[PDB]
Subunit: 233 residues, 6 copies
């Protein structure tokens, strides 16, 4: 396990995972009680703390499916982890998707062939654990947080050469594009754990619409609160 | 539209679709008020009637994705249809899935390359409309009906040469196997309509467990009630 | 065998198969002596009767390869069937193909990956049994029936998103497009039985040319006579 | 046209093509009247002569689809050629195929993706021109020559790493394996010319059975006579 | 350029890139004169300094092709970078490869389909810039450093489900396995820049042989010296 | 070994291989001492002689990967051959590549799926043996011969239907296109022997620029000298 330098018991059974380790740090200091840094190999920081009297971990997963699923695999297999909630952002690919929306990823597709390889060569579906999906939905509603539930696409190239990619996603109903969601779901199915991705909208790929920093921050907070409440049993 | 011999206005905006046209007939006579047979080209029977004072259609879609999506495409494009709920059965591929369970298909994968072709060559996710998925879930719970929500796989060959197929589905968490669900979802995304598949368990591919005809019938009734309540706005 | 409700001995060794079960019915009443309905599960009607003192069956196979090969597989494996002749129609994709022509499908290609899966992952040829192909050719000539022998393509999507599909078929010499021929041939090779598809022209995809109902009916009759004479040893 | 050093009019409209240029030479000296060597670039010899008072060419095509279709393309496009009959040998892959049989290749499959590329990305059928196929069949019968008509497979690697290849061909009904037939057929369809492959059995891949040189020679003669009679209008 | 928070001129034309940003830091403090941290977004640290009076940058690229090529793309396109040398480690897959060897990656293959997508759908070669490859080779020899030059494979799943993967690499001559080399080379070809990967052996996948920390450190130093001398014009 | 009619010991451990057997003949008469023709099956001529007192063979390999790798496989497996240097020509696909340049193929890509099949289904790199690549480079420099070292692409269709093929190669840095290089390299890796392709420029696919016969001949001589000096230990 050359990639995580925690002790075997150092993680909660749920790990919330942004891409950016500095985001995990921020969450650990801002939202968690008594967070302790448990891993920092390669600057990929992770923490274990408490939320509303319950144990919970938050850790960066870095960029791209390859990065995410490597960390994910180690958490599951060496650190006893049973649930991973990804918190990220996506580029919006529907007109009805708004800058302030939180996206709950019901299912994801990808151009990474790593999922098909996990599922014995077949193109099996890769989706969020429903109980978690349902819980986050319910909480978003109880909290008056604007959500959209639907499909995302995780692409391997942030700088993809296919100029028709975004229009292709729009034509098929896709809510937005990210890099990792599909990886997490594939990993979760293959590994037999639970997962969900909750995402804010970092850009609108159709409109290019801009936001104030305080609008950006309200999204973030909403996503974190939602991820924490969903995680905590 | 050589495949449906209805008039343009003859369908409700929702169509419930079993595979077997004789099942559609049975549903129209048993559950609907004032059902009228509106189509019978090629013995593929369809009906329009009322449930709890609301207009609703039920029609066979035949066997396999090719069959299902052809009818589906005509309904959407020539008959103004906005929602299709498939009611089917599947072969169970998890030990925790029971003979009496109703399966709500969150998402589906397939070996039909027809979905990838719809979604511009990309392997985009194919899933149920969440509002419908959530509604059926809620109703199943309100009604005390045993549900499981998760992934299905739709295979093109009922008699598939791959002996490892069923074990492959089990290893990846899949709830069961059918023939059409993935087709419906792909069609729905590409066509911009709503869809959901609700399924009973016709066989258990892991245990081979048997049922009385009255157990089989209780499943069926549950599925129909659920499909009707989900459909009706 | 949940899809055919005949007794094990209820079929002749040859089964003629249109897509439409109502077509099988019509053939059984119009051309066969003493036809008996032997199967009607799911409204998919099939018959066994006599032609010129010889036993022969005719049965619908429904729409799409998935449908056709499921029925085909059951006939071969549970009902002792040794020969299947498909009688269908196709959309013509050559200028020299005329509305009144009967097409004898020498070989077929497809976008269904079900054939490659049957043939161990290799893209092996899928063609008509030559003895049958030769016999139908000979009979068409003896009878003065206009035939064309060549290649067909069976596509999975009747409503295919590729606008260049028809021109693509034309550029490569293809006589016309249908939905099932390739499936039958693949099944036949894998199962070790004999097969042939005989087809009329339902539309001309290049010219859009129209026909009187009596022209349409003369094609049909020709195809049936040819299928019957080919079948009968 | 750096590969054929004939003059534009130097070929007959039909070219008979073995793989071995020394075989073409032998045929030109043994069977043709007044054969003239018309090309010898790269030792790939070709001839134009007369058979029964009709003009006819015979030329080596070398080994593998890449070789065959390069020459084929030049013949069609720069030398006005309208028909190519391949005369070859194959490794037999059916028990009922005998050392003395001449195989008429109705259709061919391949692992060369060059055919799919010709046919716009689709896996369209690649088969012999029926009129030619029928004529050779008829002549073989009139001459009392033992024929089998069916499917061949053309593989790119004479020394293929897949040990299950031969059994795979057997399981799917394939008559035997060669290197070029599929290439010729694909070329012919794409180029709009006529073609046919006639083949003797050089080895039996199932039985390993051996032959006297005079048995080998009787096959050859039969194939040549058949190819000549088929070609000559 | 949300991923690098340097100013446009902050990088040298060559960037040396380990996976681990803490490795870049260490190199900047240990080998560079006057290194300045120029980027730290997401804890992905990068530096610009001097080696033997010449300007040079060193930056982490994180784990997996997706990560590497995202950073790579930004460096090339927004920061004027003309050359990237990856310094990494690999799992050895040949018996003749030793724990103390430095590997110069002549060319790389991958299971990432991102390279094929860069090269217009074709599986074009992805290799090191020869001038750089030759220079590093020469320097290794002048310095008495043990090198091996050959092929690497970059796999997307550090935890790959294919148990035959390592034996497969061995059977084909491959020197070892990593995660990113192929990505860098594909990026370099598509972007028109220069690149090379120099790698130490972190594990021997065939022998599992162990090393002292001082043996591990001598490899590292050798690799760094080599990368620096190769980079500096 | 029906394709080479030499005795088992008739070849040197290195074989230089042009495509054209008449080129091998010419080389054997012009550059070798005491060359003896050792094989001529199918007009594919090969020779064994001496260069500067060392034993060396030269043999045609014909056109296309299928041809090349068949001969290559026989040489390696039945004739003890340990090294094959291909001498060919390519169509140039870079502006900086000149008519007088000799190309040293560092690595090659292909549309032949034969390489992937050799390397267990993975798209492993196929490249020249570095020691040979380095030696030829060194000699070219010592001799004042203009070289370029980089990537080639070997295509299966000399007459390829993709009009964007050449521009695609240019966009990705490729030096030029041939038919066989990739095959040789794949064979070499799978078989565990050494290989290298040295190539002259027969056409410039970007500029269409023309040459005198004496310019063409100077290239050739350079290539031969280089191949001989590289081969001879």
């Amino acid at each position: 396990t050359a990639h995580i330098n925690a002790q075997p018991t150092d993680f909660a059974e749920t790990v919330i995972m942004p891409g950016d380790p500095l985001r995990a740090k921020y969450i650990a200091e801002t939202y968690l009680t008594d967070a302790v840094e448990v891993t920092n190999v390669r600057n990929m920081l992770g923490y274990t703390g408490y939320y509303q009297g319950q144990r919970i971990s938050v850790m960066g997963h870095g960029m791209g499916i390859s990065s995410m699923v490597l960390y994910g695999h180690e958490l599951i297999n060496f650190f006893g982890v049973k649930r991973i909630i990804r918190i990220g952002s996506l580029g919006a690919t529907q007109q009805h998707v708004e800058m302030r929306d939180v996206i709950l990823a019901q299912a994801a597709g990808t151009d990474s062939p790593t999922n098909a390889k996990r599922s014995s060569g077949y193109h099996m579906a890769t989706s969020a654990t429903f109980s978690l999906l349902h819980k986050a939905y319910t909480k978003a509603n109880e909290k008056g947080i604007s959500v959209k539930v639907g499909n995302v696409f995780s692409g391997d190239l942030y700088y993809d050469p296919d100029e028709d990619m975004i229009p292709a996603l729009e034509r098929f109903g896709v809510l937005g594009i990210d890099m990792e969601v599909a990886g997490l779901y594939g990993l979760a199915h293959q590994q037999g754990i639970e997962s969900l991705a909750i995402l804010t909208v970092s850009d609108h790929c159709l409109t290019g619409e801009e936001t104030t920093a305080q609008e950006r921050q309200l999204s973030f907070n909403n996503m974190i609160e939602l991820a924490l409440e969903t995680a905590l049993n």
